[PDB]
Amino acid sequence: AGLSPEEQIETRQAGYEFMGWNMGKIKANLEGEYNAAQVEAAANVIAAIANSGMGALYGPGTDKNVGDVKTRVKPEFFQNMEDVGKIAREFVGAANTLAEVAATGEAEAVKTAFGDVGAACKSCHEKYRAK
Amino acid sequence: AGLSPEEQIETRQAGYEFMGWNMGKIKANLEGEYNAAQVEAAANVIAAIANSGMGALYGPGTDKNVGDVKTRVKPEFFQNMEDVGKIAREFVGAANTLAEVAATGEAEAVKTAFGDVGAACKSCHEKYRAK
Ligand code: HEC
Ligand code: HEC
Predict the structure, then answer these.
(1) How far is B95 from chain A (nearest CA, A)?
(2) Domains recognised in chain A with CATH numbers
(3) Which atom of ligand 1 is nearest to A117's Cα?
(4) Cα–Cα distance for residue pair B56/B1, rounded to 1 Å
(5) How far is the alpha carbon of A123 from chain B, nearest alpha carbon, in Å?
(6) Cα A96 from Cα A103, distance rounded (Å)
(7) Which helix (H) or strand (E) holds A38?
(8) For residue B4, how many other CB atoms are within 10 A of its CB?
(9) Environment class of residue A122 by beta-carbon count within 10 Å: exposed (0-12), middle (13-18) or buried (19+)?
(10) What gap in Å lies between CA B110 and CA A62, rounded to an integer?
């Protein structure tokens, strides 16, 4: 009926990976020729994936390697769900602000908001992603 | 950024897999009971990834397996770029309408727009993806 553990692991990893491509495209525009419409579209993807409810992909047996599929989540992610929830809400707030300032076309304002979204990816990885 | 072949195949598959999870959530809501806010967030992911410039992920060298990174794109894709462009434009128009209508909360209107984006996904798979 619903997604199996191994499918939930592949899907959250797809979501994270797609955000990474869009993060790299904003960094490449900030350093080379800034194209405001390309940054806006990339920022829009990060805000949409941050609001997508990825919490639903951390269901019961997804704390371990299942089949052919390997997870890098640390077991502490489960057991610290209020802390996870708070970092997650700091991340949708930073992701929503990037989308809003990307819409102004001003690269300097985008540099700052991008730095704050980066911070939020990093603080969750630091505590909850292995090795 | 200017990605390697490996990274282009891995990212395009990650975008598609994440759009499939969100399409599955809209069908679940249409068949079970509708949570309007859930459908809006899933619809906005589809339109943001449709608008993200994934055409950039079908560069040279990406038409075959690169190392042990496997791809399911048929060689035909790369021969028929005019047809791929036609399909891809109608896909982002349809994905744009799905996010526009899902924002109203009107389940019956979401039902036909969802069918249009679905049609656009299988039309490209029928011609250009192995199986
Ligand atoms: C927790 C609240 C997280 C936030 C916010 C972000 N990421 Fe993360 N990420 C997290 C975990 C627990 C994991 C491991 C998932 C697993 O099941 O293995 C990850 C993983 C990634 C990956 C690797 C995906 C893969 O190919 O296997 C990437 C590229 C990644 N994360 C990127 C990323 C970015 C760019 C973020 C902010 C925009 C971001 N993540 C936030 C946990 C969390
Ligand atoms: C062509 C113009 C396409 C449109 C529109 C959509 N898809 Fe597709 N998809 C396409 C190709 C050529 C491939 C293979 C890519 C590769 O390098 O292997 C795919 C693949 C998928 C996948 C599997 C990805 C994976 O992780 O291996 C899924 C789940 C998928 N496609 C879904 C999907 C959905 C739901 C679409 C519409 C909303 C959609 N695709 C559009 C080409 C095209």
Answers:
(1) 14
(2) 1-131 (1.20.120.10)
(3) 38
(4) 9
(5) 23
(6) 11
(7) helix A36-50
(8) 14
(9) exposed
(10) 32
